[PDB]
Amino acid sequence: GPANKVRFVTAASLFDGHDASINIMRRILQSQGCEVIHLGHNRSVQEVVTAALQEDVQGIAISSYQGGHVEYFKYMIDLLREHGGEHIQVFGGGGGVIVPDEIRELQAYGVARIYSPEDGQRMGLAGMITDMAQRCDIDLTRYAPTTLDTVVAGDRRALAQLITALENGKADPELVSALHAQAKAAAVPVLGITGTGGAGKSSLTDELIRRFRLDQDDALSIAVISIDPSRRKSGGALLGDRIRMNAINHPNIFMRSLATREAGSEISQALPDVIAACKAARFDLVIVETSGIGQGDAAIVPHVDLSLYVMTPEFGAASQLEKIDMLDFADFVAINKFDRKGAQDAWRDVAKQVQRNREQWHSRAEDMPVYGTQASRFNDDGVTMLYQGLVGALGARGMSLKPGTLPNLEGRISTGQNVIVPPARSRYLAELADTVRAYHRRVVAQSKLARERQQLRAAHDMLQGAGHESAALETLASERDVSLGAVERKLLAMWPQMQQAYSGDEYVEIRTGLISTTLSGTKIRKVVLPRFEDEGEILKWLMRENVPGSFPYTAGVFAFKREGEDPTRMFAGEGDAFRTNRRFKLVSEGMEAKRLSTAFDSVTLYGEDPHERPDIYGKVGNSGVSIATLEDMKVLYDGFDLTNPSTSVSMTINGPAPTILAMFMNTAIDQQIDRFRADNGRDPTADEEAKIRAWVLQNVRGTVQADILKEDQGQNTCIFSTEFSLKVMGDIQEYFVHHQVRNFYSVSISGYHIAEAGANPISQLAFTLANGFTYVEAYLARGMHIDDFAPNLSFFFSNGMDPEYSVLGRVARRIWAVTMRDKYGANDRSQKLKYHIQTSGRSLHAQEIDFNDIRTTLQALIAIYDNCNSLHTNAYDEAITTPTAESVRRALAIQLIINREWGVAKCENPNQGSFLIEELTDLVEEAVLQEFERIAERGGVLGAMETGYQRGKIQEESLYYEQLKHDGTLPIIGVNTFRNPNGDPRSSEDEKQSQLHRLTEFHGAHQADAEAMLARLRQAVIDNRNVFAVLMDAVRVCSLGQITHALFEVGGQYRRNM
């Protein structure tokens, strides 16, 4: 494509998980002939710049969708100019966030281009990329040094540019020979790491580097040369090795991503020169990673001092190892992903093969340099064992290094304990699908028997009343009585008594009104019973769709809808704790049913404290409330009695959820302690306070999202390793059990984010239920009684325009009810699936936003029809801006009008009976079960995730949606049809300074107890004790950021996967 070899560094801004099109802009650059060093999402300026300067790129592409873009790009321009990167051009995404004034401001500041959506429609998507790629079509070898003085001195920016000249072959021959002469005299070890594609080389390399740093106290200068294959046709390349490296962010670590620039070889054609360049730069160790090579490859061997073959337990038969050329030269062999099935057996086959290749029959196979590692696991002892081995090898390879600080332990095999879903239970989703289908087979069988029993006894009476009698009929009828189950027989027996119950004006100690009378005088019954005469139809209906509040709870989990509380629960989250608390009081104004829904800013969502640094500062307060300390949390819910039975608090938080939950619990407790110090005019005693805290935990109502699994399925907002988050999430659930927290739900299992990514209703429902069942299987494998954690499970679904949405809730309820009763044998409280429905954000369009209220009304209606437990209605202008004041009342009026004015809604089961509803229910349910089977044959949710099945399927359904939408096949009123002939088309500066002031004040107040508490927290993780229990005390003297980063030091950060 271009003239020179153009290299880019692409990333999403800090705390910004918006990677929807950063996967597509990388595709285009790779198909125009650019080498893109992709850094993924959630990147600080310091990270992107350090990457750009080392990779020595011509351009940088950043996509900022969370705001705070101005401060971010200004910082990047400043930091670039300061450290010799002023010739690097910075570009901005085509998002509709950066307004025209902010574009001209940044473009004048130093930013190359910031493409407006106006440029999107005009230039085209490929058009913008083409323009951007042509601007960066410059030669960088003219910035390269002509003498080795700067590079040898230690200047890394000179090293990075010297490499560019060598990679392009634009370096003077006399300079190259002097470089190799300097490298030979340097005498530094070069470690080669090769293996198949995706084996975990980059991940393991990162972990090994981490080991080096911790073991030698960052005293070692390590250079890293990673190589990824380049597309033959284009000439460009995808260099996705840096995106894995979490331990290279240090002045002593240097990394350069090289393209093969050959359609065959696995290493760079200029690898020997690039290595010699790093050796001469006085590095202590040089590490080289090759690309995905076949079995018969070993090109890395002559260029390095030591070689490490990385592989997975999946290599087929044992005889295949006799084909792997690299098993003949490898000084070390790492069988990574030792968490997978057959890892143990894989280790012995390889050990025996290496033993044969080396002809060391005088030794044990367990003494071979074959290790079993799990790089995905934080502080994996397996990786450390491999590290210990490598050091000893490099030690005699002429490398001075201090005695280790790491545990010099022994063994070859990883002793992984992170057991989530045991391989024996791998097919759990399939078993569940079998259980539901088994239930339906019984429904048919029993229904047929109930009919035959009735048909006989009826015909017998007709004969006996006509004179002649045939008692033979009774014999067959009595045979049906034994055939009919004890449960089914009781159902038909209670049916007449059931009709008498739902017939009167009251449902009779306690009484409940059954009838609401209209203006016309008509009596509308809350629950309408069928008038079937056939006992086959009665039994069939009673088993498949009973009345609300009876198994399988298809029509709802409760007998009747609650009077005091509507399902309404509206979002709120803006600026600091004070402004949001004002919005909370305004939404709950004049309502006994105080049900709050909290939204946190991107800073809090990633478990970070607000800071002066332009990366974070610009994001504090946007898109959500900034909560950093327990004091902020107290202000957030001041004036509300969290313990009050009519008050429930919802809050959307995932990664840092256990910390936020801990703050909420302390807030709820302190409310009652303050209530006691007021009502009694004295502080409660040691005994009194204990009784208070206990009562608070039991009665506190609310819900925290904390769906970690959904984060590694699209939204990418994960800050902890999935295994660690699941451990702590389990720690939470155990804490709830021990203190009888019966009214708080530990997890709102989301599918909204999934549906927002383009997933059709069936896939959304199927994945969410699957992810829900994964949690169940996880806690069961841990050792929890099903009745202990199942009632604490919440759900979160997205509605929409698709027909399947009308029966989403009822299907979710029945699948849950049946499986929880039959498969897991749980009580009635566990069989009841409670969920929240929020209307489709993907159905709200930017064109003709007034039409959105029509769509949100229809979605709210079926939600209420299908007896949802909680409903949030979107404002019409959410497609363009944030929910305003006038707009949030129109969104709230939708629920109010339906619940109060709409006549059909006076009935609480208007869906039941409908031939369409029941057929759709049957259809959708089966479709979900089949999806359960597809996930189960991939190894369950976790298994499918390692391939990216969910994310892959979602992305497929998204493109299908957008295709038909643009095609006009799928009509969208106001967008692709019925277009308007006339018209073609968030946080105070004080509030930010407030949060900083409050934070530094909080830190000062607990300056003494801070460290001792954080240390206690880390020790809890090391000793595998309950983490949440410590968090209940930690949030009192430690801030959000302090806690998160303490856990980082001991729990590890999420590695950017795919």
Ligand X SMILES: Nc1nc2c(ncn2[C@@H]2O[C@H](COP(=O)(O)OP(=O)(O)O)[C@@H](O)[C@H]2O)c(=O)[nH]1
Ligand Y SMILES: CCCC(=O)SCCNC(=O)CCNC(=O)[C@H](O)C(C)(C)COP(=O)(O)OP(=O)(O)OC[C@H]1O[C@@H](n2cnc3c(N)ncnc32)[C@H](O)[C@@H]1OP(=O)(O)O
Q: Which among a second copy, ligand X, ligand Y, none contacts residue 313 (Cβ within 5 to 8 A by kind)?
A: none
Least distance from Mg ion to the Cβ atom of residue 289, Å: 5
* 284 known ligand binder: no
* 653 known ligand binder: no
Residue 450 near a second copy by CB under 8 A: no
Distances in Å between the alpha carbon of 876 and those of 881, 893, 977?
Answer: 10, 12, 19
* 266 known ligand binder: no
Residue 228: closest CA among 257, 253, 194, 248: 257
In this chain, which of 397, 836, 951, 1055 binds ligand Y, going by CB under 6 A? 836
Strands (E), 40-155: 59-63, 89-92, 113-114
Q: Across-strand partners of 747?
A: 793
Residue 724 near ligand Y by CB under 6 A: no
Least distance from Mg ion to the Cβ atom of residue 752, Å: 32
Residue 18 near ligand Y by CB under 6 A: no
* 246 known ligand binder: no
> Looking at beta carbons only, is 339 or 734 nearer to ligand X?
339
Cβ-based neighbours of 968, under 8 Å, separated by 6 or more: 976, 977
Interface positions, 922-981, toward a second copy (CB under 8 A): 923-924, 927, 957, 960-961, 964, 970-974, 977-978, 980
Omega cis (within 30) before 100: no
Residue 654 near ligand Y by CB under 6 A: no
**Percentages helix, strand, coil for the chain, rounded to the nearest 5?**
50, 10, 40
Least distance from ligand Y to the Cβ atom of residue 532, Å: 27
> Looking at beta carbons only, is 202 or 1044 nearer to Mg ion?
202
Radius of gyration of the chain (CA): 32
Interface positions, 536-555, toward a second copy (CB under 8 A): 536-537, 544-545, 547-548, 551-555
Residue 842 near ligand Y by CB under 6 A: no
Tokens standing for 880? 């363009």
Interface positions, 985-1014, toward a second copy (CB under 8 A): none
Q: Identify which range of 83-91, 700-708, 723-731, 909-917 contacts ligand Y by CB under 6 A.
A: 700-708
Residue 109 near a second copy by CB under 8 A: no
Interface positions, 177-206, toward Mg ion (CB under 5 A): 202
* 241 known ligand binder: yes
Q: Which among ligand Y, a second copy, ligand X, none contacts residue 980 (Cβ within 5 to 8 A by kind)?
A: a second copy
Cβ atoms of 526 and 574 closer than 8 Å: no
* 201 known ligand binder: yes
* 834 known ligand binder: yes
Q: Which among Mg ion, ligand X, a second copy, none contacts residue 861 (Cβ within 5 to 8 A by kind)?
A: a second copy
CB atoms within 10 A of CB 264: 7
Matching residue, tokens 């590694």: 712
What is the pattern of x (binds a second copy, CB under 8 A) and - over residues 843-882? x----x-xx-xxx-xx--xx----x-x-xx----------
Q: Identify which range of 389-397, 579-587, 699-707, 893-901 contacts ligand Y by CB under 6 A.
A: 699-707
Q: What's at 556, amino acid-wise?
A: G
Q: Which among a second copy, ligand X, ligand Y, none contacts residue 1055 (Cβ within 5 to 8 A by kind)?
A: ligand X
Least distance from ligand X to the Cβ atom of residue 312, Å: 8
> Looking at beta carbons only, is 260 or 870 nearer to ligand Y?
870
Burial class (CB within 10 angstroms; exposed 0-12, middle 13-18, buried 19+) of 973:
middle
Interface positions, 263-322, toward Mg ion (CB under 5 A): 291
In this chain, which of 272, 404, 910, 948 binds a second copy, going by CB under 8 A? 910
> Looking at beta carbons only, is 111 or 708 nearer to ligand Y?
708
The CA distance from 492 to 876, in Å, is 48
Q: Which among a second copy, ligand X, Mg ion, none contacts residue 198 (Cβ within 5 to 8 A by kind)?
A: ligand X
Which parts of this chain interact with ligand X (CB under 6 A)?
A: 195, 197-203, 241, 244, 336-337, 339, 374-376, 946, 1055, 1057-1058
Matching residue, tokens 């209703």: 761
CB atoms within 10 A of CB 780: 17
Q: Which among ligand X, a second copy, ligand Y, none contacts residue 838 (Cβ within 5 to 8 A by kind)?
A: ligand Y
Pairing of strands 370-372, 647-652: unpaired
CB atoms within 10 A of CB 494: 13
Least distance from a second copy to the Cβ atom of residue 936, Å: 20
Count of helix runs (H) and strand runs (E) in the chain: 39, 24
Least distance from a second copy to the Cβ atom of residue 799, Å: 10
Q: Which among ligand Y, Mg ion, ligand X, none contacts residue 597 (Cβ within 5 to 8 A by kind)?
A: ligand Y
Torsion region of 22: left, alpha or beta (phi above 0 gives left; psi -120 to 50 gives alpha):
alpha
Cβ atoms of 832 and 453 closer than 8 Å: no
Q: Across-strand partners of 91?
A: 61, 113
Q: Which among a second copy, ligand Y, Mg ion, none contacts residue 284 (Cβ within 5 to 8 A by kind)?
A: none
Interface positions, 818-837, toward a second copy (CB under 8 A): 818, 821, 828, 831-834
The CA distance from 555 to 907, in Å, is 12
Residue 632 near Mg ion by CB under 5 A: no
Q: Across-strand partners of 59?
A: 8, 89
* 336 known ligand binder: yes
474-481's contacts with Cβ under 8 Å and 24+ in sequence apart are: 476/452, 477/453, 480/449, 480/450, 480/452, 480/453, 480/456, 481/453
Cβ atoms of 31 and 61 closer than 8 Å: no
Burial class (CB within 10 angstroms; exposed 0-12, middle 13-18, buried 19+) of 624:
buried
> Looking at beta carbons only, is 411 or 549 nearer to a second copy?
549
Q: Which among ligand X, a second copy, ligand Y, none contacts residue 987 (Cβ within 5 to 8 A by kind)?
A: none
Matching residue, tokens 């078993």: 431
CA atoms within 13 A on the CB side of 637: 31
In this chain, which of 261, 457, 742, 889 binds a second copy, going by CB under 8 A? 889
CB atoms within 10 A of CB 1006: 17
Cβ atoms of 58 and 7 closer than 8 Å: yes
In this chain, which of 15, 664, 796, 1028 binds ligand Y, going by CB under 6 A? 796
* 520 known ligand binder: no
CB atoms within 10 A of CB 422: 12
Interface positions, 863-882, toward ligand Y (CB under 6 A): 869-870, 872
Torsion region of 411: left, alpha or beta (phi above 0 gives left; psi -120 to 50 gives alpha):
left
Least distance from a second copy to the Cβ atom of residue 304, Å: 53
Residue 921 near a second copy by CB under 8 A: yes
Q: Identify which range of 554-562, 764-772, 980-988, 1022-1030 contacts ligand Y by CB under 6 A.
A: 554-562
Least distance from a second copy to the Cβ atom of residue 586, Å: 9
Q: What's at 235, amino acid-wise?
A: G
Three-state DSSP string of 580-641: HHHHHHHHCCCCCCEEEEEEECHHHHCCCCCCCCHHHHCCCCCCCECCCCHHHHHHHCCCCC
Q: Which among a second copy, ligand X, ligand Y, none contacts residue 761 (Cβ within 5 to 8 A by kind)?
A: a second copy
Sites of contact with ligand Y (CB under 6 A): 558, 561-562, 569, 597, 648, 650, 652, 701, 703, 705, 745, 748, 752-753, 794, 796, 829, 834-836, 838, 869-870, 872
Binding site for Mg(2+): residue ranges? 202, 227-228, 241, 289-290
Sites of contact with Mg ion (CB under 5 A): 202, 228, 241, 291
Binding site for GTP: residue ranges? 198-203, 244, 336-339, 946, 1057
Binding site: residue ranges? 18, 198-203, 227-228, 241, 244, 289-290, 336-339, 560, 595, 701, 745, 794, 829, 834, 946, 1057
